[model samples]
Target: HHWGYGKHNGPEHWHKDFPIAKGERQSPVDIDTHTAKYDPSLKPLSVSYDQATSLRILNNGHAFNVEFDDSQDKAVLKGGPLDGTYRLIQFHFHWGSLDGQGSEHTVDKKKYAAELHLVHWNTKYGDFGKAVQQPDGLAVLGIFLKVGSAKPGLQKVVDVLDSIKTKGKSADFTNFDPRGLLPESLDYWTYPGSLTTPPLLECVTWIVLKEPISVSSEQVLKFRKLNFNGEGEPEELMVDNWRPAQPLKNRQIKASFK
Candidate 1:
């Protein structure tokens, strides 16, 4: 079965294709603040994004991702859990079908309306293709999205969903500032985890924000309308694209703030 969020080909069955699906240090772990230790050594996350780096958006048979130009250090994510600068390559979201539970990583077992992933690659690896295979190759910033007020930046991404509504569809997307999608506080929890999706590479230094950004109920409906199928195929809506929380294993979950 092709990898999808369906019953036959869902996350549970992914171990067949990539045995690492059940491997240690998997992603989207439930963050219990009480259990997380505060480390003063952790630095504040530094994000310098060039609005011009925004290039396009596409549906890669999974979720809609906004691509960025990573040819240079125009946009980078450094500090915090990352040693060197990591170039911003692409950003995407993971959501559930229901408003009660949409985010990938839960807080104290409480789920959010949705979750946003900002994917970056370490410059030491030379390129994303090579960096993906390394332990410190990737650093994904996770920002949970709670349903409430509307977000101006997220609206820009949401507006384009109709054009790339089907799987494999893509469109030009430019001059977007990723900072607009961020929450007020940069306080975060850091840990070692794999990509929630397959290839399930255990290279990501997970930095999940403590505070969540806002998204309107109507805005989330737009995400639900995204078609998991291609334009010519049956209209299977894209929802519940998130993988359930995995084991913490022998890892320490550190926090920037107590």
Candidate 2:
């Protein structure tokens, strides 16, 4: 029942033992949208997460850049996922090395232990802050990861986690396309939701893939090495950097094909 703690088990505790555990939105929540409702206009699409997804290593030191052509003609999504043209702005992840629950998106109260988010914005809608306001303003692709067998593809990214162990210190990664990291399946669960983070905008169209990418236990630790912290005058570390789950509040979570 104990998730573990570190660094005085308070503000410095990097494990699931963080004080935040008392709050909602903890990892390991299982995702279930069986009875939820979905939009008829919303469509399903696939993009290669392999080495061809167009990668740009950000200077932030931890985040990676992903550029997906938003053009309906170029993208597999018809009628588009969002209301306008959205280009992959960047991608990032959340994880806990020792704990089994590290993913960002929870399912039916179950957590995957690790999660990766590919961030995108609709250029047609304007800036990120503004776009995050629309129901279809932002599109985030979520990937789950659990500890066990080693994933060769994950090593490519996890190996670098140590390099950015501090805030505001990212290095350039080359020839790294996200498609290389996607699980072999395309089936997924889709819904309308808001950002898990603060300024929680109710503008995201969730695309939770049914398949998950695998990663070794070492990989999770590798990710933890990357400063799990944030930046600012009174900069804060990102350890246990997950937001509490928001209220369902009668909100219906619907799937794409279901």
Candidate 3:
């Protein structure tokens, strides 16, 4: 499916091609903190990443993704709710034109400035494509981005925004540690959900952090500079590329920390 972020062809219209958009396990659900259950059994998350494995960054029209080398187990996510290791495939962000309304997932009915998704596919399923079809195939680590002081680690990524300002543009990005972007606390909420984007497959275990990381307003503005359109085309700012929260029907949200 040639899905993208558009006024007429956005999340509201994704169900036309991907019927799972209305499925029970749909993603980006609003997290009600007061209702979340504290699960003591949930293990501490283990993240081991090799900065050298970060390959490149690109503007894929939908969002800016930092692609990683997932051919091997060099960079992997394990423990937590996962039964086995999951290779890091890529990481991306979703934001809005203004602050307070860009995050795909909300907490206690409150929205943040932006959100980051670190995508990983279970090694047990072999490949990401195959993983997307199985029940326990993929995992996404989500981190909320709030307006605050500039993050040096994030600045490294923000620096490459100009090079890939237009859709389909890409540049070499390496030696960047994704772990640096995470907040001090590893506490999170886990639930079964689908990919927020089309082919909205119902095969992801979402781990959303409780604490949000800091990012300056200036750094977020750089993201706004990105265009949804490519070079030689009518310009459209790449803002508000976030899907609204879905209904939580007969599902439980397990919290890692009390």
Candidate 4:
């Protein structure tokens, strides 16, 4: 049931495999720096990781989503990480069919092998769903994943990929902290934007990290092995499960520096 990467294996069909994806506002989007008007309000909030946090895994068949429960991520607003407490709802990833470059967000027209989204909601706004409709309500951290390196920056999560290999199968991923997946540096670019996926609500304050993580070739190949057979004819198999980058829509790309 593996739908190999290509124009054929699309995000539209992923809902059938993982219905929760429909409710999640996460995706890698294309950002054009040319039209971006750099703003000064954006700042880096001091962010940290849990020393020994527990983890939970959910099997959507196509991809795996890691959840951090009752986690209040703190940072300084317009300074370091926002000082206000934000809850870590969930984090997911996007991939391509062939393993060459399948990520949603691209740099200077170059796509990476994969993209990871660390989604957090401003508990300052009350609810995550409602926060999805504001300018600075939601903050999403983006990182690129390149092949041919010693680490994937995701060793903790990928180690359990085998447990949720099949459709509808899940595993308990406790004793694993989600912070171990971040890249080397937190320096990033911020901006006003919307979710790259459908119901593209323009409520996200995007913070795209300039640096990318090193994911070995063998680590990425695992995504290409997803099963796409569910309903409909031809028994479509999913190889690359990522949507193309969305339009910037006159939005400006703000940054933490300059």
Clashes of each: 0, 33, 0, 17
Which of 2 and 3 is ahead in lDDT? Answer: 3
RMSD of each: 0.9, 6.8, 1.3, 5.3
Model 3 is weakest, by summed lDDT over 10 consecutive residues, at 44-53
Which candidate, 3 or 4, has the higher lDDT?
3
Clashes of 1: 0
lDDT of 3 at 69: 88
lDDT of 3 by residue, 1-258 (tens): 467777678888898888889899998999999899999888889888754288899999989999998887777888899898988999999999899789999998899999999999999988998999897899999999999898888999998899998999999998778978989998999999999988889889999999999999999999999999999899899999999999999899999987
Q: Give residue 224's lDDT in candidate 2 (0 to 100).
A: 62
The lDDT for every candidate, in the order shown, is: 0.90, 0.56, 0.91, 0.62
Give lDDT tens digits, candidate 4, residues 6-120. Answer: 4443465544654533443344446555544455554456555453344677656456677665444432123433435455666778777666767877776788888888777
Expressed as tens digits, the lDDT of each residue in 41-107 for candidate 1 is 9887898875438899999888999999888777888999789998889999998798898788998
TM-score of each: 0.98, 0.71, 0.97, 0.77
lDDT of 2 at 166: 58
Better of 2 and 4 by TM-score: 4
Q: What C-alpha lDDT does candidate 2 achieve relative to the native structure?
A: 0.56
Single out the weakest 10-residue window by summed lDDT for candidate 4.
72-81
Arranged by lDDT with the best first, the candidates are: 3, 1, 4, 2
The regions of model 3 sitting more than 4 angstroms off are 50-52
Give the winner by lDDT: 1 or 2.
1
